[PDB]
Amino acid sequence: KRERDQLYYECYSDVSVHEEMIADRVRTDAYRLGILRNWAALRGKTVLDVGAGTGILSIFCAQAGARRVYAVEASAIWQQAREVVRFNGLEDRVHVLPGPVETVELPEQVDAIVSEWMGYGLLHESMLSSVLHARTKWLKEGGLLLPASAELFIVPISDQMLEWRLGFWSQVKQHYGVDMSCLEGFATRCLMGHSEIVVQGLSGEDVLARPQRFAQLELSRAGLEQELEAGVGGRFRCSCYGSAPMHGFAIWFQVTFPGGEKPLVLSTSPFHPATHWKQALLYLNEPVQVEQDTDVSGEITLLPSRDNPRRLRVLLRYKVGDQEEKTKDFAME
Amino acid sequence: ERDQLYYECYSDVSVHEEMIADRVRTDAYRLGILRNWAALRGKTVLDVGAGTGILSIFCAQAGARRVYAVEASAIWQQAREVVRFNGLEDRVHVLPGPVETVELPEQVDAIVSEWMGYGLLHESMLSSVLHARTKWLKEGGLLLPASAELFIVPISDQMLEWRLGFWSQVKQHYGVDMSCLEGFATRCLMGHSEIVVQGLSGEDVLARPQRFAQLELSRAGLEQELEAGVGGRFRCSCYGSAPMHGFAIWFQVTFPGGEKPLVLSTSPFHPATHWKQALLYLNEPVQVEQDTDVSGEITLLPSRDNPRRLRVLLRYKVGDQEEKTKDFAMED
Numbered sequence A: 001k002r003e004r005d006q007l008y009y010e011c012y013s014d015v016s017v018h019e020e021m022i023a024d025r026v027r028t029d030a031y032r033l034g035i036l037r038n039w040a041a042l043r044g045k046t047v048l049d050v051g052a053g054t055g056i057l058s059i060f061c062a063q064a065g066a067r068r069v070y071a072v073e074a075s076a077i078w079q080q081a082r083e084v085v086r087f088n089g090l091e092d093r094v095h096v097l098p099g100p101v102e103t104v105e106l107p108e109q110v111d112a113i114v115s116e117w118m119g120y121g122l123l124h125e126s127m128l129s130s131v132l133h134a135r136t137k138w139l140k141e142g143g144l145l146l147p148a149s150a151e152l153f154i155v156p157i158s159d160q161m162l163e164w165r166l167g168f169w170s171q172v173k174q175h176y177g178v179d180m181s182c183l184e185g186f187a188t189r190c191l192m193g194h195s196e197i198v199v200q201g202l203s204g205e206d207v208l209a210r211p212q213r214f215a216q217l218e219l220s221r222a223g224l225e226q227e228l229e230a231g232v233g234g235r236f237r238c239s240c241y242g243s244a245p246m247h248g249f250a251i252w253f254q255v256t257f258p259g260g261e262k263p264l265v266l267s268t269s270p271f272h273p274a275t276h277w278k279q280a281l282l283y284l285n286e287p288v289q290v291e292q293d294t295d296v297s298g299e300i301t302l303l304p305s306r307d308n309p310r311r312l313r314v315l316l317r318y319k320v321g322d323q324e325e326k327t328k329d330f331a332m333e
Numbered sequence B: 001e002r003d004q005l006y007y008e009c010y011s012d013v014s015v016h017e018e019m020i021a022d023r024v025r026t027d028a029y030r031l032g033i034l035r036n037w038a039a040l041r042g043k044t045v046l047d048v049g050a051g052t053g054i055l056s057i058f059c060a061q062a063g064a065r066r067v068y069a070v071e072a073s074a075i076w077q078q079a080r081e082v083v084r085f086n087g088l089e090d091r092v093h094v095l096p097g098p099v100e101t102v103e104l105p106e107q108v109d110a111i112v113s114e115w116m117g118y119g120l121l122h123e124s125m126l127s128s129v130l131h132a133r134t135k136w137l138k139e140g141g142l143l144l145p146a147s148a149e150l151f152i153v154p155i156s157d158q159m160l161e162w163r164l165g166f167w168s169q170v171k172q173h174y175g176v177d178m179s180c181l182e183g184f185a186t187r188c189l190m191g192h193s194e195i196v197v198q199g200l201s202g203e204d205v206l207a208r209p210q211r212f213a214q215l216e217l218s219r220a221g222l223e224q225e226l227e228a229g230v231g232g233r234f235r236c237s238c239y240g241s242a243p244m245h246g247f248a249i250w251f252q253v254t255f256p257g258g259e260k261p262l263v264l265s266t267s268p269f270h271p272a273t274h275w276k277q278a279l280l281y282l283n284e285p286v287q288v289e290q291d292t293d294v295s296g297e298i299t300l301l302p303s304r305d306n307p308r309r310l311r312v313l314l315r316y317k318v319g320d321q322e323e324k325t326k327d328f329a330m331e332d
Ligand SMILES: Nc1ncnc2c1ncn2[C@@H]1O[C@H](CSCC[C@H](N)C(=O)O)[C@@H](O)[C@H]1O
Pocket: A009, A012, A018, A021, A022, A050, A051, A052, A053, A054, A055, A056, A057, A072, A073, A074, A075, A077, A099, A100, A101, A102, A115, A116, A117, A127, A130
């Protein structure tokens, strides 16, 4: 079933997703400046924009002096990108090509590749293998990748929003004169007992320890394609700041653009301004009380599902202080 | 088999959290039940769709000697827990299964139910309640609520206006002109034939809201009239100059007094509720002026494939423009 790809691209054929991406100021301005600061590597050069969407990133490349930009797009939105390119008078420099980047035939190797491939938890959608497949095939030796690298972080969390949802049932008497405190367990089983990856914004005040980096993806490195199938991650460890009910873990990513100037980082940390990626939350089955200097440690692996390769899977093993090591397997909403 | 998937939606906590957190809804049901304490003292009540059991416990608190709390989804176990926890195991009996196939020991003096979906009739729970009235309600029995009215008005959704205008703003933000995508945006967002559940304010309302249906729930033969369609004709005149994006529909229900009668509205001129309003978009904007004639017909139906999903047939005419038709289905 390669018709699994048709239902994936149908999401990107609609305007709403692209509105959400372009409305994400942090994301779109990171790409704008990231491209601009690498003018030296881009003036006069050829560029491959993998998954051009509405074509905004391809136009940034042309505005930074690129002589030719190949904007490859697999969904029907390619029609709108051609229209936008034509509308800005850039048809002679920006050429939009339909179809997947795997099957696309360009007339030449390229000097640089740009792509916004990051999904939720970085690797939801599994777009990275397309980008790496295109690097190996089309990018010249020592050509520019934008962004050039990625890192993943994990940290234990106490989600205050969830806390109020669990506590809701104890507030019922004071409003309506009926005691529903006994449904606290039920709500915990409903909201924490399931095995889905929740994509939700957190505050920095919900963070219970130093965020630990558990993966580092240098996109130039050959053989990185093969490692994504086996999984991304490894062990983590940290000690908590204080007293709180730990609900689970959050994960987020960052990506780095090189300078020419200094490097630009695009982060999805809760200590930074929000993005449409938000954070990926991994809830325990029930809350666990931790104290100042409670040592939390464990193992995490990000990989694609068996059923749908584009869907993200997270295998977590964890140990909260004294407790026995527990396990939980998640899949994106 | 089809009905089992519907009940499963009410097995999760989130849906009941949302309903109980709707203070306008829950206070109206509390206060509506409390108003009829005289008629309910020492009487028996059926609670169709008991959920977590909160409405049954209002009836027991109001003085009913016996309440049968009927609930088809697995949440009946949570309703049993709450009853026992509140010490009302003698006065409230939680009976699992659908209300169609439940067996009570007696006929009841009153029926309470919160049955209203998005656009009132989404979910098609009203048939279950009307069947329960015929089978279990005594003569001169009480229905809470007792009636329902449906309203419609042309609207100018600001949230949509922002989303359509977005593509002209890209130049100012990022230095790339994408104003050429406005038509595409409109075709995606307005050309889809789905009923959008969204909250509006008073500024969004473009003319005097018009009632197009009344449902007296005691009326016999109403169950058959629901399958045929609930609806009517409407006409109104626009207040002033604005871009019309479609129609909003909403409802109200009325509890009898026993004191003045209590009205639970989901109008945008009254306090907000989880029902919000149900929006029916045109295929594109139509610019209107003061005293512009908007008229049409609306019919609320069950969908072809799925009887519990709400369908809306809309005929509409706006000013000099010819009469147009559009078929909507509730958000998938
Ligand atoms: N293998 C592949 N080949 C070509 N395009 C792909 C692809 N996999 C995903 N895409 C496309 O890549 C885009 C990812 S979203 C990024 C969109 C664009 N850069 C913007 O900022 O607006 C989508 O439009 C999707 O349809």
